């Protein structure tokens, strides 16, 4: 009786098709363009031994954490390029990092299948492992804090999970994907999150209940990055077919596509600006592009790296944007 | 210019850098390897005997240190991953070599091994990474051929029209049929390797048994040759 599934699929497709009458390009056709955007490098941060995989800004817009394949976490001071801490890990194949909103903890994980939480404010002067969370059956690809006691992870196996840090257990388990889950992004009010997998689909979940809420489709290939619009009602994705897309939660549709005929490499990171007018994306051809979110025209280029750009992040007050590459350097742009 | 606390902070940063330099010294002198193979391949025996003769339930990756002639090696393998591989193989595009272990006494699961090797060889992120292949469990192949119950021509049609290459070196003295068989296996793998190399990476074959005691030296020799090739490319000699 899978015909019921097929028919329900066709019915959902039709209901989606009805609601589309105008596209975002038509409505935005009557607004002024952003023009050229020149952004120059200000600082260069040196000290990593090998390629960089992740970075994440602090809430105060000054501190910064980065992770590298040599087995280090380094906490930087962006304004002066000093080094504040250097945490040596026990497994060298790290693939993610996060920096808690309060500023007390950091997290990291990788091919070891463990999410490790570190304590930065102790009576002794060192940084000590607070807790190790185990229970996944594959590599951990992303992790994000909700508050000081809850964390959300995504794994190489199809599952995402929500942990309690005091008593280290899974309160809720999210199932439903088919391929590897690769990215994660929390809503600004911390009641929903979206995840993107290797079956070319993304899903919105509900934290309190634990059921899958909606499912979006497109993209013809893997999804490597995902991010919420500041509003809380849209998100943008990046894929291995050299395209980015923007989805909206209420319309359950797709709005615009950012693509060009010269670009043939895949996207590795996506981030929005403070107002939502600029979409920043990294690429495998060593360069980072700046797109205009409402008109789908390139506005600028950030070309300063000698290998692929792996991470990208915009600060909370909108002053700066940072990028890290496989040449083991971070660059603060403005 | 800048106050007292900022001077103390700069001092702290300079000390942190010193330690990183020390770490770099320890990291530029260690060679990293990756161990790949199937379930029937005896890679567990290799790693166990190498760990003995020298010097946690869903855990994902293992470690193994060993030393030959005062040179350090790390050897990693992946424990609790799924069947798909195209995603986490990108973390290993700077290793020195990939060690590939294939069982040569199955005759039934061998075409899958050939396909897997073909997938590793042509990966987009593994161009400029060499491969050391071990054709393990030789003696089992010896009894299997000698008994004669199980043929080989039935699974592979083109075996009849094949004859031993002129540069073969059967050392201890054994029946020629086993020599023909094992060189046919090696020639399949080397044909896949020679298809599209383009001169950027090479494949080093070996015949081994999982119990013998000469594998570390083989890896040492092959890594010597690989690093020599890279240094020729770097120092503008070719």
């Amino acid at each position, epitope marked *: 009786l899978r015909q019921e599934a097929e028919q329900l699929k066709n019915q959902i497709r039709d209901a989606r098709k009805a609601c589309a009458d105008a596209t975002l390009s038509q409505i935005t056709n009557n607004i002024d363009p952003v023009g050229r955007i020149q952004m120059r490098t200000r600082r260069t941060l040196r000290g990593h031994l090998a390629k960089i995989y992740a970075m994440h800004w602090g809430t105060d817009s000054r501190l910064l954490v980065s992770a590298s394949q040599d087995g280090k976490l380094i906490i930087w*001071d962006s304004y002066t390029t000093n080094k504040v801490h250097a945490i040596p890990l026990r497994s060298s194949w790290v693939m993610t990092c996060a920096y808690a909103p309060s500023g007390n903890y950091v997290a990291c994980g990788g091919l070891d299948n463990i999410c490790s939480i570190y304590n930065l404010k102790t009576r002794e002067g060192n940084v000590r492992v607070s807790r190790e969370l185990a229970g996944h059956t594959g590599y951990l690809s992303c992790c994000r804090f909700l508050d000081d006691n809850q964390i959300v992870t995504s794994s190489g196996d199809t599952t995402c999970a929500l942990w309690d840090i005091e008593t280290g257990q899974q309160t809720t388990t999210f199932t439903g994907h088919t391929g590897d889950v690769m990215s994660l992004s929390l809503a600004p009010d911390t009641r929903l999150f979206v995840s993107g997998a290797c079956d070319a689909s993304a899903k919105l979940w509900d934290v309190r209940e634990g059921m899958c809420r909606q499912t979006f489709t497109g993209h013809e290939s893997d999804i490597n990055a995902i991010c919420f619009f500041p509003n809380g009602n849209a998100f943008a994705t990046g894929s291995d077919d050299a395209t980015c897309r923007l989805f909206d939660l209420r319309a359950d549709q797709e709005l615009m596509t950012y693509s060009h005929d010269n670009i043939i490499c895949g996207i590795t990171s996506v981030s929005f600006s403070k107002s939502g007018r600029l979409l920043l994306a990294g690429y495998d051809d060593f360069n980072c592009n700046v797109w205009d979110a409402l008109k789908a025209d390139r506005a600028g280029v950030l070309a300063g790296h000698d290998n692929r750009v792996s991470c990208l992040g915009v600060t909370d007050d909108g002053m700066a944007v940072a990028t890290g590459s496989w040449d083991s350097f971070l660059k603060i742009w403005n | 210019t800048l106050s007292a606390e900022d001077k103390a902070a700069v001092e702290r940063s300079k000390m942190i850098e010193k330690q990183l330099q020390k770490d770099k010294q320890v990291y530029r002198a260690t060679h990293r390897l990756l161990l790949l193979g199937a379930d029937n391949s005896g890679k567990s025996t290799i790693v166990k005997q190498m760990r003995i003769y020298h010097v946690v339930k869903t855990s994902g990756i293992f470690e193994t240190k060993f030393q030959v002639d005062k040179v350090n090696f790390h050897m990693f393998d992946v424990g609790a991953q799924r069947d798909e591989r195209r995603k986490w193989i990108q973390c290993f595009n700077d290793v020195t070599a990939i060690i590939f272990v294939v069982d040569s006494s199955d005759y039934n699961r061998l075409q899958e091994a050939l396909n897997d090797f073909k997938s590793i060889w042509n990966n987009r992120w593994l161009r400029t990474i060499s491969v050391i292949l071990f054709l393990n469990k030789q003696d089992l192949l010896a009894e299997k051929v000698l008994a004669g119950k199980s043929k080989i021509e039935d699974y592979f049609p083109e075996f009849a029209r094949y004859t031993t290459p002129e540069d073969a070196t059967p050392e201890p003295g054994e029946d020629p049929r086993v020599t023909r068989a094992k060189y046919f296996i090696r020639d399949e793998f080397l044909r896949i390797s020679t298809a599209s190399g383009d001169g950027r990476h090479y494949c080093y074959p070996h015949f081994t048994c999982s119990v013998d005691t000469e594998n570390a030296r083989r890896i040492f020799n092959d890594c010597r040759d690989i690093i020599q090739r890279m240094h020729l490319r770097q120092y503008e000699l070719l």
Partner: single-chain antibody
Amino acid sequence: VQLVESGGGLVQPGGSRKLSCSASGFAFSSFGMHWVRQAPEKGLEWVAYISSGSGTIYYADTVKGRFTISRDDPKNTLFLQMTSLRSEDTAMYYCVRSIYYYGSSPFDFWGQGTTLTVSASADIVMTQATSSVPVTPGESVSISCRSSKSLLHSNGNTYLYWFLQRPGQSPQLLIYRMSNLASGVPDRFSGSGSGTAFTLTISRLEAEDVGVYYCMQHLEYPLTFGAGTKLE
């Protein structure tokens, strides 16, 4: 964490002695160390400072050549070598711990002290007001302070510190860098200021808040303290 230190007793004028401070319970090698002294009934005065890595040392004006400071990381001990001891050196010496990075809190732990009795310019000055305020429990008090040169820096930081010394024991940190409550202090305390004049305020006093309040500056060496005010 605890620092326990010993040395000292009656000693003749003109001699020399060596003081030691034993540390345990924390990572000694990544902290700076200070020595702070006070006379039998007067206030505090700074003595020396040795940093992590032993690459930076400072001394006061009155001990510029007689004293010498050193540390021993693997044995986890701090030393102060005194030579040619006059009679103005009778005081009680303290062992204080300090770390410096963005957002840290210097001067946060103080050790107990060793008594030492000897038988018979262009630097910032900090002035305390009238040194006595009678108070009844449950009221509110407004201890004040003053300075000569402005302590505000182009960073945006203001370097002023506050300490409390109960009758029995060694001082405790309350406010660091003019507006931050140190870890472990109740939320009753609060402090503010305006660039040259400063103020510390206590909301609803309790029976364990009586003592002497000292101020401190950290803009440039040497570090000057001020007389302090008592509460009864």
